[PDB]
Design a protein around this ligand. Structure first.
Ligand SMILES: NC(=O)c1ccc[n+]([C@@H]2O[C@H](COP(=O)([O-])OP(=O)(O)OC[C@H]3O[C@@H](n4cnc5c(N)ncnc54)[C@H](O)[C@@H]3O)[C@@H](O)[C@H]2O)c1
Ligand SMILES: NC(=O)c1ccc[n+]([C@@H]2O[C@H](COP(=O)([O-])OP(=O)(O)OC[C@H]3O[C@@H](n4cnc5c(N)ncnc54)[C@H](O)[C@@H]3O)[C@@H](O)[C@H]2O)c1
Ligand SMILES: NC(=O)c1ccc[n+]([C@@H]2O[C@H](COP(=O)([O-])OP(=O)(O)OC[C@H]3O[C@@H](n4cnc5c(N)ncnc54)[C@H](O)[C@@H]3O)[C@@H](O)[C@H]2O)c1
Ligand SMILES: NC(=O)c1ccc[n+]([C@@H]2O[C@H](COP(=O)([O-])OP(=O)(O)OC[C@H]3O[C@@H](n4cnc5c(N)ncnc54)[C@H](O)[C@@H]3O)[C@@H](O)[C@H]2O)c1
Ligand SMILES: O=C(c1ccc(F)c(O)c1)c1ccc2ccccc2n1
Ligand SMILES: O=C(c1ccc(F)c(O)c1)c1ccc2ccccc2n1
Ligand SMILES: O=C(c1ccc(F)c(O)c1)c1ccc2ccccc2n1
Ligand SMILES: O=C(c1ccc(F)c(O)c1)c1ccc2ccccc2n1
Ligand SMILES: OC[C@H]1O[C@@H](O)[C@H](O)[C@@H](O)[C@@H]1O
Ligand SMILES: OC[C@H]1O[C@@H](O)[C@H](O)[C@@H](O)[C@@H]1O
Ligand SMILES: OC[C@H]1O[C@@H](O)[C@H](O)[C@@H](O)[C@@H]1O
Ligand SMILES: OC[C@H]1O[C@@H](O)[C@H](O)[C@@H](O)[C@@H]1O
Ligand code: NA
Ligand code: NA
Ligand code: NA
Ligand code: NA
Lengths: 257, 257, 257, 257
């Protein structure tokens, strides 16, 4: 309850799923948390539930929303120590020929440029506090995924951007790291599975993609985020895998012709 | 002179630098090559110089230019076997706070979406020929670079997109690979160095960033591209490093406090 | 003080350096710790200093020493939750032609087979407790190091072995992870630097190999180990980098000929 | 037929499987090849079949055999340009608790130290010719494999050793690279499958572990080796994946508990 006491954290997309798990983990570590989300429902309830968390409506694709998010965080709490760029989306499975450049641009706006924009506006305050940035990327940025060309590209960009910014901000004492989750059971996972012919079979395949035989939990991503913020003082530019071992070994991906 | 005989290759940004080296390597392997570039000067001369290469003016950020590039390649040569997505740019060094979302969008349009667009329009023809895609990414997508947040992000996206598309096109027999060059001596390298306070010192630092103690040549990237196209039939989704060992070992990147 | 309460941890090479930092971190988390070392001096003092830590003399290259280490841990504390395989050595810099197969075998015995042997003897007890294995590898297993062919090979083996065992033990609920430190200021670092022509210059080069501009501390590796043991329940087979960003960007490793 | 004309290549384990494919590829490129193998049957026949290849009986675990291999290569052909360290073995699947330290030592002797020993004895001659080293590692050194702790560890060591030696030999102009094959259809693959309850099912699983839906061929590893030797002059310390995409995407490796 004291690992991150006295610190102020902003979590984007904090109203449900991984983001809400990260919010809870930081509150449990003693921090004050600003929950950013484009939707009011989950985040407002979380603000009522958790002493030490407050909700600010903010769409990270809207630069003026993000400017207000940062200025209100500083006005209300007087410092900013950690930004967790969690807001993002995975579209339904799409074959490459079914994608469009305009859909790709829109997904880049959320998954990549929203992370870029908040980070940029927050960095002057993170420099003052020797704070840190945590980006939520994805394992599939590293290893690929089927029927997800735009999504995979956006997460490869987030992971690479994390390393570039880590280099640039290292002289100023600001660490920049990312977490790459694998299959985490969240409302997005449940929504995507419900679109499939056999949702239950899709969910079973998702569980068995991990050597551990289950999906991950938001709380497990949250613990990884609290570690990076509060105890990983010699880590910058890392990609922390929270995947249950999905990237390990041979599997079903499809004699020598 | 026969490793890729009878095949038809499109090289974007083929008028100078790495692209021209790739053009030359494919012509030397027996292929017919379409040189795409937004600038006429280098590519037109290359078409006069090389029997088997022709020049088509085409800005890869302009979807209708790219549509015409593909339709003219098919009209003139009757097949398409390999697309090399080489067109790209590295801006001058820029501190993160000096970047803009709009500059970032513009660089994504070239380095990422131009590659996406040509690949999409070419894939129906590559399926017919069991052809392949070669994207020119960058080592710094993998390891980061200072003062280059947008550039690094675009190359992380290209490398990840390569793996996603490799998965999607594997059932159709179309391989998708990338080359990640390190420091290659090209007109872009020379132009960026000339902007620096001490261009000669910048160039010396660039040479010594490699264990091999020199920069790479366009011809060396070209040989790697010809290998991927013509002889790497069990390679898909790989990132072929052509970096002189820059990613190896400890170096100068900046007692325990 | 409660994150790992009630748990029992064995740390090899725990008498000084990173190992002692790991011992301290686990004691501070509420665990009981068995300090294994081949030398009595540091570990015996640490046992007097820390309530909750005890010292067992044990050379991890001697199978019967390791058998007794495990049986005494169980006899004295009734369970085993975590094994930290930290014992290892880095020889002085050696050019490849100055190495020997017999020196290579000896270093494999310590850095690789000692880790293998303790893990094997501990796994029946870790299965009962759903415990975990933490191996201390090295960044240079991943990126290489000059004048260290045998050492680098042993750490590449440890990191790979970690992933293999993670796969094998996943059905039994036992996680297997590794930490790859970069330059950590330890008595070994100080001893190796003292052998060099200009020890102070060697130490300065070591600090500047990190974007953060300093070396790491044993306490920072220890915090990473406590995270992996106590809060990383969806992590198995990962390589957690604790390197200060040394693997990022271009540096001094040595125009196109 | 001229890419590697006038050059002299040693291939260990060249009598069958991948090694024989590499021998054939180098002969087809114009090189003279010394086939090293511990067994006479395949290699002697290959020497009769291929003008430009000769067979030398040599067990790479026996230092005096390897000394004679190098001295006879120089005596008979007057130079040495490339060493391909292909000899190696994969034991039958073994659960971790079924392995032994002594079995692990024996596999290290072949897969790791045999590569080390030939490389060491060859390097004085490779320096004179600005030649290169190609080690045959494995994809599973990078991603792990089930029931193969010793094997995986040996290949992680080979890949890491490749990078270390690349650093050390870069000032002398000698490149050191590795190839990491995935599932390649070889007599070893066929022998291991025949040990399983349902060999045909094991082979089908092996094919489907690749997005390409087949296993690789020795000839495909051979083409990769010829590329590294003859045309990859700015590549050193790389790991060239010849895996059919097995490392890409999610698969079958085994809702959030
Ligand atoms: N669930 C997984 O398996 C998984 C795996 C790897 C990575 N990720 C990443 O984790 C993050 C969270 O995923 P999730 O599964 O929890 O998703 P989710 O859809 O359950 O939750 C996302 C939250 O972000 C909010 N959000 C979306 N767009 C926003 C915007 N423009 N501005 C502000 N808030 C916005 C949503 O309203 C929602 O509350 C995403 O970046 C995702 O790419 C998820
Ligand atoms: N030079 C290096 O060290 C280096 C290193 C790693 C990666 N790369 C990548 O290699 C590629 C080539 O780089 P280079 O150094 O040869 O650059 P360059 O600037 O010398 O050549 C690039 C060529 O692409 C053309 N081009 C640019 N924008 C275009 C567009 N919109 N449409 C069509 N053609 C366009 C240019 O006119 C030029 O002829 C780029 O993708 C770059 O990111 C270069
Ligand atoms: N210091 C670094 O920069 C660094 C970097 C990366 C990895 N590592 C790894 O971290 C680990 C600890 O390194 P360190 O710098 O603290 O070294 P150190 O030499 O300061 O401490 C090592 C400890 O292990 C003990 N030990 C050695 N051989 C042993 C054996 N056979 N049985 C039992 N105990 C034995 C020593 O007596 C000593 O107390 C090693 O595995 C090393 O390879 C260190
Ligand atoms: N087959 C695959 O799927 C695969 C995948 C990845 C890596 N590899 C690696 O490729 C290499 C070749 O494998 P393969 O499948 O062709 O095996 P193989 O068993 O079919 O052929 C190996 C050859 O090496 C020889 N050899 C073995 N021990 C030797 C020794 N001590 N001295 C000299 N020669 C010796 C054998 O007699 C044989 O001719 C090995 O290093 C293996 O680990 C193979
Ligand atoms: O959101 C999904 C996902 C999964 C793994 C990742 F690493 C990641 O970043 C996101 C997801 C969920 C459900 C799905 C269902 C079918 C197909 C794809 C699906 N993807
Ligand atoms: O274009 C450059 C570059 C270098 C390495 C890469 F891997 C890459 O993709 C591109 C470059 C050139 C010259 C420079 C000069 C100063 C700073 C950065 C520079 N970058
Ligand atoms: O022990 C050293 C070391 C450094 C980095 C690592 F990643 C690692 O595993 C071990 C070390 C110390 C001091 C030195 C001094 C000179 C040369 C090498 C040296 N190596
Ligand atoms: O030799 C095998 C192998 C496979 C993939 C690799 F990447 C590698 O280095 C070696 C192999 C063959 C057949 C098998 C059959 C069952 C289990 C494992 C098997 N392994
Ligand atoms: O909807 C799937 C899961 O999403 C998670 O974020 C919630 O914490 C779980 O209660 C829920 O089962
Ligand atoms: O401008 C730098 C270099 O660019 C390369 O693309 C050209 O082939 C070289 O002739 C030139 O020296
Ligand atoms: O010897 C170098 C360093 O080693 C570390 O393990 C100790 O904790 C430090 O007190 C010491 O300065
Ligand atoms: O035994 C499996 C395969 O091994 C390869 O090395 C041979 O070239 C093939 O003819 C054979 O089918
Ligand atoms: Na509240
Ligand atoms: Na022409
Ligand atoms: Na004590
Ligand atoms: Na012959």
């Amino acid at each position: 309850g004291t690992r991150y006491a006295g610190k102020v954290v902003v979590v984007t997309g904090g109203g449900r799923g991984i983001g809400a798990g990260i919010v809870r983990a930081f509150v449990n570590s003693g921090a004050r948390v600003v929950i950013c989300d484009k939707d009011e429902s989950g985040g407002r309830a979380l603000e009522q539930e958790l002493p030490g968390a407050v909700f600010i409506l903010c769409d990270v694709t809207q630069e003026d929303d993000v400017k207000t998010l940062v200025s209100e965080t500083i006005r209300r709490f007087g410092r900013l120590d950690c930004v967790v760029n969690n807001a993002g989306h995975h579209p339904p499975p799409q074959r490459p020929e079914e994608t469009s450049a305009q859909g790709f641009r829109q997904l880049l706006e959320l998954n990549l440029l929203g992370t870029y924009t908040l980070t940029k506006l927050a960095l002057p305050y993170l420099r003052k506090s020797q704070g840190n940035v945590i980006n939520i990327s994805s394992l599939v940025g590293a290893i690929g995924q089927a029927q997800a060309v735009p999504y995979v590209a956006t997460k490869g960009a987030v992971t690479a951007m994390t390393k570039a910014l880590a280099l640039d901000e290292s002289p100023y004492g600001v660490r920049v790291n990312c977490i790459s989750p694998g299959n985490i059971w969240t409302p997005l996972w449940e929504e995507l599975a419900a679109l499939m012919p056999d949702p239950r079979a899709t969910i079973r395949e998702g569980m068995l993609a991990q050597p551990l035989g289950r999906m991950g939990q938001p709380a497990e991503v949250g613990a990884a985020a609290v570690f990076l913020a509060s105890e990983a003082n010699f880590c910058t530019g890392i990609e922390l895998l929270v995947t249950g071992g999905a990237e390990l070994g041979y599997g079903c991906k499809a004699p020598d012709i």
